[PDB]
Design a protein around this ligand. Structure first.
Ligand code: GAL
Ligand code: GAL
Ligand code: GAL
Lengths: 518, 518, 207
């Protein structure tokens, strides 16, 4: 429209209908010029990397992008409480995105003194990758999200991507992408941008914990009509061999026949937060579970979903097998345990093997009169028919969706870090300040212009997501576990601003409070 | 609309119809950035407070708000005179509010020299809390009103609020509010804002004084048919006991039967403006009437409405029991009596007990041949059926409405400081300059941006209130008391500007001049 | 429950335009008398003018569940709040709704002023505190006076050059205009309705 008109309004609320929740978030952003308007080849060579496991090849772009892919972008802590205490499930449905009130600014420096002024004719350009033709970086859990607290102003992160490498080198199959080779909308102050998106059908996240365990599903009062082998010897001494059979029943539940078995396992090393209980060695990398791809070792960072500890063992956690969030102000490198927050998957204990335990035991031989029966431990167990499992829980600090990789086959493509896997996730939204040349020379020169006006932009972003709810139908008589604030006096309010103005999230909050039968 | 068009006009007049008055006020405001765009936890610890009675916990916000809640915002002194001399009652009916001609400005400092320029693309954001979802601070009598004199330019006050505390700490029941989590309208120069409001039904304020007193309502010429106990002894000496009864009549009015009794009382300590008549001790706090809430003592600052002094005792005033206004230029702390203006409620003397007197006397025992009759003084008297009272008078300097607290029960929820109590008062109007980041760094950083362009806004506000009038029907023969200016020569005109340009209000003006029968 | 208290409803950042009497003497010594006035503001919140005051009070005796803190006497009936009807004394068993204790004082409870439920299998007569369940009204602390405290203080005299200012404690306070209160909370074990007695008049007939 024009210089003097606002191109959009602040809309931050949430709206609870019967089976639907509509979250709306507005934030203020700032976009720098990245890479001096250049595309740059980057690799572990350009960054000085060494180990082959860390080698990479790729490109950094002048562009930047929006990430709303964490839940605290869309939910206040109160809204999150309201979701998790009342609902068995939820999934995203629709998306609405807006860019408005764009302001492009010019920075001039004289001597040690900078002046900022509006550049009214400068433009910002924006496009969504709707055909998913770019490397999708939103499914890796990155910084640069919209801030959880609506009054914070955030920097837009720089877009970059990786392609195939051999060491620091690239192969011929490596692909380079110019983001200028897409059509994009150009925006002066007074222009706005919007688009809508439909989430594809995704199952409801399970926001409940089971009130039954998979090995306890029997009627405790009644025998089975099945028999098991109770006794193989008639007693001490030579040549005592029998087959004795007993009814499996209430008194021996471990031996009863069952129709369903716990889900798959890939075993994690167990680490105690009580520190003297740990070995006196460096096992962090060496003792870690990992998978290998093309000679590279990638740590298996989230487990396949697994229970983080056994009952009462809460001090234990799987080495890499859980999500670790930092507290507010926690540094980058080598921080103590009290400065991070270790998620635990304890609720899926009912259907899922413990991350730090063997799946079970198998027979390793044929017994005989000569040979005793031998068993061995199953350290990793793939899918078996009859397995049943829960996915990893999702967190207010955590990711929402991932892009399912485009491949011939996948199994149960729920993202291992948690959330909703999608073949066509919310598309990437790319934004860039268009370069404005400084004064060119008065004689022609064929070289590309390397001299530009120093410039940055700011504005507002609205994200509106419609969420579908699955209500609790339970007949449970006794009251349930719910997420609560604690009444006891404290210097600060949890999930509130500091005395210095710093918003913090004191604890990770999962979704699983309400219960269901198994 | 656009940069070059005015978005509204100055409208300041008042319009007197038959039973309606419409006041319109326009002022010029300036809005700073508050708190460097931050929410801040505040408490008596952050301010250094000590006593438990003064302890608090709360938040200061970057937002600011409009307060038109004093009468001098809407009434010129002449209009006020015209209201109070001609009318038995008035109440507010409708409200219309406008923000227009917004100007956002940028401040740059080089060395000891500041330059102010327009920022044409910057925006201001505004919303009303229509659902009363925020702590309501307009019902406490605060500075920051629209100025009584239309040519004065005023600063918008900063919005803050308190929640539950224990000492300086907060409890889990304490609530934090982000004002960004409301939808608000964004305004560039050329955008304007308006909304309308309907006052809910409120009784007319009583702008009259009674021409009768509650104990004089009888016919002075005629006896009662009731009898009272005149004499209990037949004379001096032993064993003189009788019951003698007399007709209550014109000669003894104190003893007549009456149908209605004066309203409730909570006794205030009496202070003389003649200073040698006061005790030589510090009684201000120690001798003060107070109420206790959760171990805190709050001074009972306005009385329940009560008469400020007896007849001819005008030098006396209740310790806290009246409203005290400062004169123009009166300082903050420890000022002499001549620099303030002490309101008196003298007109309600007819139906209301004197603030500094006991309500009356009650029997404390059973008399008998052994025991003399004993009485005691009633220092505080709650509501009794048959009580009748007037509310506190309202003032041109004083507040208009309060928000009735949201509770299971209340009694006669007329605000004790005076005015119109409402469950849904005029809503809070919140305004903020939207933060404009300075130049961000060219490498991504996840920290919220703490560097902003220094900025402030100005504009105009219109408030239009429709007032309903209640005319005088009186049959009184003799002329009445009216508010007047005094003809005698003076250096300045009252309610006019100074020789230095300073507007002042020389006296508090109540509403009660005309009379009614009781 | 209220997230604000009735005495904290102000804007903490802004002064009042009202004044209060801060100082009555100019100092030590004879014949020091002044009237000094100050703005009520963020630093002194206790003295600010307010539009609404806490609800009515009828004072209850305070009993500690820590037993050595109680007096060594039988006060159960003798120290109890009561009302009289036709020469009969009825213990005032539920208070008019009032806050059961001050902050952090949870060990205290009003003598009769709260509902006491028995646990399962609790006997009829003279049972220990661990066999009953003492309700507390702590949430109404924001608008309601504490059951075991005085409502406040009133002036009992006229001060003068001869007489110092005297105050006295208000043990019971009836309704005043401008009072605001919460009703007693309701419980899963508790009653639902009552019949309002059929009478000429009643006030706020919440059971
Ligand atoms: O290969 C050895 C290295 O492996 C890395 O993945 C690990 O983070 C390092 O600590 C180091 O042990
Ligand atoms: O508690 C003692 C104090 O109480 C305050 O409310 C009063 O304003 C002070 O003057 C001081 O007397
Ligand atoms: O009047 C004296 C009696 O009063 C009763 O109401 C009380 O329950 C008894 O314990 C006893 O003290």
């Amino acid at each position: 429209d024009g210089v003097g008109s606002s191109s959009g309004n602040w809309h931050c609320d949430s709206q609870w209908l019967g089976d639907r929740v509509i979250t709306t978030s507005t934030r203020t952003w700032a976009l720098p010029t990245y890479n001096n308007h250049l595309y740059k080849q980057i690799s572990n060579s350009t960054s000085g990397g060494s180990s082959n496991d860390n080698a990479y090849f790729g490109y950094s772009t002048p562009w930047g992008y929006f990430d709303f892919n964490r839940f605290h972008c869309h939910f206040s802590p109160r809204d999150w409480q309201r979701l998790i205490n009342n609902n068995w499930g939820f999934r995203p449905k629709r998306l609405n995105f807006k860019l408005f009130n764009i302001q492009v600014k010019e920075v001039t420096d004289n001597n040690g003194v900078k002046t900022i002024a509006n550049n009214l004719t400068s433009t910002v350009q924006v496009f969504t990758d709707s055909d998913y033709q770019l490397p999708y970086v939103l499914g890796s859990a990155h910084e640069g999200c919209l801030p959880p607290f609506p009054a914070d102003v955030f920097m837009i992160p720089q877009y970059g991507y990786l392609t195939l490498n051999d060491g620091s080198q690239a192969v011929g199959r490596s692909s380079f992408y110019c983001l200028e080779y897409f059509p994009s909308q150009m925006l002066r102050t007074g222009n706005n941008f919007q688009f809508s998106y439909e989430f594809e059908n995704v199952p409801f996240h399970s926001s409940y914990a089971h009130s039954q365990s998979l090995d306890r599903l029997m009627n405790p009062l009644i025998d089975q009509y099945l028999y098991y082998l109770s006794k193989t010897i008639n007693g001490s001494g030579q040549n005592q061999q029998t087959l004795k059979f007993s009814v499996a029943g209430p008194s021996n539940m471990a031996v009863q026949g069952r129709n369903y078995i716990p889900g798959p396992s890939y075993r994690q090393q167990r680490v105690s937060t009580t520190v003297t209980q740990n070995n006196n060695s460096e096992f962090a990398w060496p003792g870690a579970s990992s998978w290998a791809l093309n000679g590279r070792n990638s740590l298996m960072n989230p487990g396949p979903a697994m229970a983080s500890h056994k009952e009462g063992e809460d001090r234990f956690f799987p080495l890499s097998g859980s999500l670790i969030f930092g507290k507010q102000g926690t540094g980058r490198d080598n921080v103590d345990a009290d400065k991070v927050m270790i998620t635990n998957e304890e609720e899926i204990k009912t259907t899922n093997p413990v991350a730090t335990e063997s799946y079970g035991q198998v027979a390793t031989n044929h017994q005989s009169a000569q040979a005793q029966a031998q068993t061995g431990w199953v350290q990793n167990q793939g899918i078996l028919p009859g397995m049943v499992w829960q996915d990893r829980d999702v967190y207010l600090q955590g990711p929402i969706w991932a892009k399912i990789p485009h491949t011939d086959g996948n199994f149960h493509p729920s993202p291992l870090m948690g959330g909703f896997g999608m073949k066509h996730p919310p598309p990437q939204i790319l934004i860039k300040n268009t370069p404005v040349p400084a004064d060119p020379p008065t004689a022609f020169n064929k070289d590309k212009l390397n001299s530009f006006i120093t410039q940055y932009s700011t504005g507002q972003v609205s994200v509106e997501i419609e969420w579908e709810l699955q209500k609790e139908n339970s007949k449970r008589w006794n009251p349930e576990i719910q997420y609560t604030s604690n009444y006891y006096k404290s210097n600060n309010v949890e999930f509130a601003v500091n005395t210095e103005g710093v918003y913090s999230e004191p604890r990770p909050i999962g979704t699983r409070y309400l219960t269901r039968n198994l």
